[PDB]
């Protein structure tokens, strides 16, 4: 009675495999273990949320209070957590908004369902309960809409759109960053009396150029872009020509050499004497044609030779490398020209227009600025960020990426209508689902009630970060909905929040309809998978 018989199925699967089935207690092991990371996204929620510093294995430090950026770097051994990880990444790549609700609503459905499993309700019935509750949630959100927008062009109308998104990440900066993003969208959208038929928009239109140093208030908007690059050859005129035609060549400016390797063959010395002048006259025949039409700027992606640069210096033509291929096409969108791997000659139809190009230092480093006034632009803009630390500017970039991603979420579908925010529609869904559970008798009614209780974390998480008592403002808020005016009740965050009532229209806090629908679906599908599994099979390392 000292050594056990060692589980005589040990002839089966190797020691590295670990089984954690149910009955043994898998659900109890999982729902709990994940409460640690549930508090991470809960503390980082709201305008007063705390950012989290994540140092990866390489050492690149990041500080972001989202959920998709954090969990991407966290090497998590627990498999049940990873269902929540890439489910949040789906929200990042598709909509770019709601990572946090997903990590929070998906985890709370597992936390609140502790009562159902512990009481002894069937796991199969719980999946059917949340699925039917999911369908009722999607149908009911359409009726609580009061922000039906149809203009979606002017800048003041975006104050109900961008400023709630920017107010979440770093609440202290609202008017400054909203002016940068809203002015960027106005430059992106074309000037027209009526632009319809689903005009195209992409996240790559608005780029972010991070410059070290300078206060956030000193930032400005640039219609072109700004590269950390050294110009060569001459100083610009900056007002003399009034406009500049810019040719963008994929291939470098050099004598056309083949892909297969060759060399110089000379049978006699007569060709040796003319070979020194032949290379000069060869490029001169191709370079003189470019200068006739007045191309005052050339952009060659590959390395430019010194012989080609020498002929361009005397005529005063600007040169630029732009080695990366992705950022090469964005410059073409500004001027409105096409790429040309052939040398050929410049044509008027394929060549664009650029007002001026000027060179200075913004944060000590010399950069090239492609700002133009009175010119025609189409889907291009940049926001020059000035900040004290690179760690803080990284969060401003992702905040802007989430802001412009919401613009993609609006203009791509037919309607991206608003909803009441600040803990207004979430408590309404608790009343709707509470009334829905009594309409259908059956054993699944317990699942319908507990699905509503999971939505409680949204108001109190704003109160917990605000340093307020949850047991005072949360039940007091229910008395305000008794009865339009009752729909616009929300959670106040201020020193005068003892009353617990603040009107939404005074500050215009709103949320998107499509963002919450996609978040509720991915959250329910995430909880559906974790509650459906019973056995989890590991492996060695």
């Amino acid at each position: 009675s000292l050594r056990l018989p060692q589980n005589p199925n040990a002839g089966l699967f190797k020691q590295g495999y670990n089984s954690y089935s149910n009955a043994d207690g898998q659900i109890i092991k999982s729902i709990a273990a994940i409460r640690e990371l549930h508090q991470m996204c809960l503390t980082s929620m709201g305008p007063c949320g705390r950012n989290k510093i994540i140092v990866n294995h390489l050492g690149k430090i990041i500080i972001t209070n989202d959920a998709a950026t954090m969990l991407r770097e966290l090497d998590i051994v627990h498999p049940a957590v990873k269902v929540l990880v890439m489910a949040t990444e789906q929200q990042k790549i598709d909509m770019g908004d709601g990572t946090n609700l997903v990590m929070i609503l998906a985890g709370e459905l597992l936390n609140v369902s502790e009562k159902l499993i512990s009481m002894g309700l069937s796991a199969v019935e719980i999946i059917q309960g949340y699925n039917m509750a999911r369908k009722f949630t999607l149908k009911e959100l359409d009726e609580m809409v009061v922000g039906e927008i149809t203009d979606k062009n002017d800048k003041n109308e975006l104050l109900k759109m961008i400023k709630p998104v920017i107010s979440s990440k770093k609440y202290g900066s609202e008017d400054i960053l909203s002016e940068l993003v809203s002015e960027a969208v106005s430059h992106v959208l074309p000037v027209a009396q009526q632009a319809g038929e689903i005009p195209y928009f992409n996240v790559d239109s608005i780029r972010v150029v991070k410059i070290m140093g300078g206060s956030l208030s000193n930032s400005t908007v640039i219609k072109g872009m700004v590269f950390n690059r050294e110009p060569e050859g001459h100083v610009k005129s900056l007002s003399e020509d009034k406009k500049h035609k810019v040719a963008v060549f994929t291939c470098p400016l050099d004598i056309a050499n083949t892909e297969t390797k060759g060399t110089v063959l000379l049978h006699n010395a007569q060709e040796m004497l003319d070979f020194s002048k032949g290379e000069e006259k060869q490029i001169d025949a191709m370079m003189k044609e470019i200068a006739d039409m007045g191309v005052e700027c050339i952009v060659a992606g590959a390395g430019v030779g010194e012989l080609a640069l020498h002929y361009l210096n005397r005529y005063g033509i600007l040169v630029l490398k732009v080695p990366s291929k992705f950022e090469l096409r964005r410059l073409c969108r500004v001027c409105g020209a096409t790429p040309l791997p052939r040398l050929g000659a410049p044509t008027p139809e394929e060549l664009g227009l650029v007002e001026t190009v000027k060179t200075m230092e913004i944060g000590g480093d010399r950069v090239t600025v492609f700002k133009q006034e009175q010119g025609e632009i189409s889907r291009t803009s940049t926001i020059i960020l000035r900040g004290a630390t690179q760690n803080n500017l990284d969060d401003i970039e992702r905040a802007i990426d989430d802001g412009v991603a919401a613009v993609k979420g609006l203009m791509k579908p037919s309607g991206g209508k608003l909803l009441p925010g600040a803990g207004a529609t979430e408590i309404e869904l608790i009343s709707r689902i509470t009334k829905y559970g009594e309409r259908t008798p059956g054993l699944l009614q317990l699942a319908i009630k507990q699905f509503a209780v999971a939505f409680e974390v949204v108001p109190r998480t704003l109160a917990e970060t605000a340093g307020l008592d949850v047991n005072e403002v949360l039940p007091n808020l229910y008395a305000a909905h008794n009865v339009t005016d009752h729909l616009y009740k929300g959670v106040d965050i201020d020193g005068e929040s003892d009353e617990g009532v603040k009107d939404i229209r005074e500050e215009n806090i709103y949320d998107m309809l499509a963002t919450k629908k996609f978040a509720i679906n991915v959250a329910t599908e995430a909880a559906t998978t974790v509650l459906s599994i019973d056995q989890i099979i590991m492996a060695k390392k």
Binding site: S1, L2, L4, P5, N7, P8, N9, A23, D24
Partner: protein, 538 residues
């Protein structure tokens, strides 16, 4: 639940705890399956010391081979505890718990609860106790049938040893047991019957001695070897020196006073020897024909041995506690401790006392008693394992035959008890019983588990076990309608049925009763257990 609490632990639950109890049961069953029956295989046990000990008893196999499994240690205590008081039925308990677990485990896989299954074993066990009253047969001890005791002795001895050892050792037990029965009818096994080791000519030369044999003899040469009429004397007083409770120096002053005080060592011994001489003066008549012998429980000083040698008194020292409790039964005398009050009534009687020696050791033989109330069984053997094999055979044979005289009943064996319970449990009306629900298979599981024992006897002979029960089943189908009460058996010589009533195969009453009771308790407790774990400080 146990891993976050204890940093290191092992836990099996709800499928492995059931597989462990069945797999360990089938594993331990396969060890003792081949030993069961008369044609079973022998089994030696040699440790790192190199000694050898040979026997077929399951208790010796279990209580000598260390075992790590938690199930088998309960089978070891169950097989040992049943044999330690009864002396028979060791492997039968292992086969029942070895078979009843696997026979119930098939229905646990079907999804029947362990609680209601064990409820069927308990109510089925009560039916077997009611069946023992009708199945047994009354036997009157006043007849004093010696042939009936010979057949009971051959039941256990044929299982352990062959026919050559059984025929010569059977009447050794019968002559010892024939003296057990008396008017008081009080059974006494440990004090009356004993076993003693002696390396001699062969195991076949075992003989019966009616008196008490002793493993010591006369130290001095001049002391008599053989005595015709020796009247014994029991004295628990120690006749050597005694150190005397803190008493210290014989402070001697002069040299003559030194030896004068050294002579006082003899005065305490001579004070007790004079009482023996005064006792010898009363029985001094016919001194050359008669004799006298003294047996002491503690040591005797060598200075005093010369006193007994001069008077031709045989001296024996350092006897056991058990031998002092047996001289009164053999010689018929009475015991004495102090030398103050003596009488001729306490002296025993012996018709022949002689000594025989081999090598350095010497044995004293006493026999030819007038009315001996006890006796001994001096077993001969060649090797140490030969004595150990005869130890377990005589130990299990005396306990099996002694239980027949305790009660007035005896159970016939050879599968008659198990085959009879099979038809009884499978044909009895269930409405008479109080069990309902899913107790249908519990009756069939325990009833079918009893069939595996009598065919395990056949598995050692090599015949087909399922075919030799065909005519057995056909015999009982016609025996009930033929109006003839007979009990069938299993003869392994020819592979056909037999009758244990005429063949002499029998079994004791409390063996099968305590076996099923101990086996049903252990097998039920192992089924209800659904979790195994190890935890503690070390």
């Amino acid at each position: 639940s146990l891993q976050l609490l204890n940093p290191k632990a092992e836990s099996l639950r709800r499928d492995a705890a059931l597989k462990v109890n069945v797999t360990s049961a089938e594993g331990l069953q396969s060890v003792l399956e081949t030993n069961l029956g008369p044609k079973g295989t022998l089994k030696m046990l040699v440790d790192g010391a190199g000694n050898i000990k040979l026997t077929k008893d399951g208790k010796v196999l279990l209580t000598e081979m260390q075992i790590q499994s938690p199930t088998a240690v309960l089978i070891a205590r169950a097989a040992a505890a049943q044999d330690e008081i009864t002396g028979d039925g060791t492997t039968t308990v292992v086969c029942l718990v070895g078979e009843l677990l696997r026979q119930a485990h098939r229905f646990i896989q079907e999804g029947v609860h362990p609680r209601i299954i064990t409820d069927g074993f308990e109510i089925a066990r009560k039916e077997s106790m009611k069946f023992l009253d009708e199945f047994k047969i009354s036997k009157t001890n006043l007849s004093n049938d010696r042939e009936f005791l010979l057949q009971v002795a051959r039941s256990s001895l044929l299982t352990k040893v062959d026919a050559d050892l059984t025929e010569v050792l059977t009447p050794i037990v019968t002559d010892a047991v024939l003296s057990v029965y008396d008017a008081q009818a009080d059974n006494l096994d440990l004090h009356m019957v004993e076993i003693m080791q002696m390396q001699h000519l062969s195991p076949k030369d075992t003989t019966f001695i009616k008196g008490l044999v002793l493993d010591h003899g006369g130290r001095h040469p001049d002391m008599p070897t053989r005595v015709k009429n020796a009247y014994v004397l029991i004295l628990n007083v120690s006749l050597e020196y005694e150190k005397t409770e803190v008493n210290s120096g014989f402070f001697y002053s002069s040299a003559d006073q030194r030896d004068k005080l050294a002579a006082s060592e003899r005065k305490f011994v001579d004070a007790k020897l004079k009482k023996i001489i005064d006792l010898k003066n009363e029985v001094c008549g016919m001194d050359p024909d008669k004799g006298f012998v003294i047996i002491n429980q503690k040591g005797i000083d060598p200075m005093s041995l010369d006193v007994f040698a001069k008077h031709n008194i045989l001296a024996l020292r350092r006897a056991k506690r058990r031998n002092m409790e047996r001289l009164q039964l053999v010689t018929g005398g009475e015991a004495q401790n102090s030398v103050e009050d003596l009488s001729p009534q306490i002296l025993g009687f012996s018709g022949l006392v002689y000594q025989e020696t081999i090598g350095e050791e010497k044995f004293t033989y006493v026999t030819e008693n007038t009315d001996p109330k006890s006796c001994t069984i001096l077993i001969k053997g060649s090797t140490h394992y030969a004595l150990a094999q005869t130890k377990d055979a005589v130990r299990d044979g005396l306990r099996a035959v002694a239980n027949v005289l305790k009660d007035k009943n005896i159970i016939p064996g050879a599968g008659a008890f198990y085959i009879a319970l099979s038809r009884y449990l499978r044909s009895a009306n269930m409405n008479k019983l109080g069990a309902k629900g899913k107790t249908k298979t519990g009756i069939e599981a325990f009833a079918e588990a009893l069939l595996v024992i009598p065919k395990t006897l056949v598995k050692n002979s090599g015949f087909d076990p399922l075919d030799v029960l065909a005519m057995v089943e056909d015999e009982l189908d016609d025996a009930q309608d033929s109006d003839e009460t007979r009990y069938v058996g299993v003869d392994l010589n020819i592979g056909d049925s037999c009758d244990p009533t005429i063949e002499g195969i029998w079994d004791s009453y409390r063996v099968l009763r305590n076996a099923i009771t101990g086996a049903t308790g252990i097998a039920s407790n192992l089924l209800l257990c659904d979790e195994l774990l190890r935890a503690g400080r070390s």
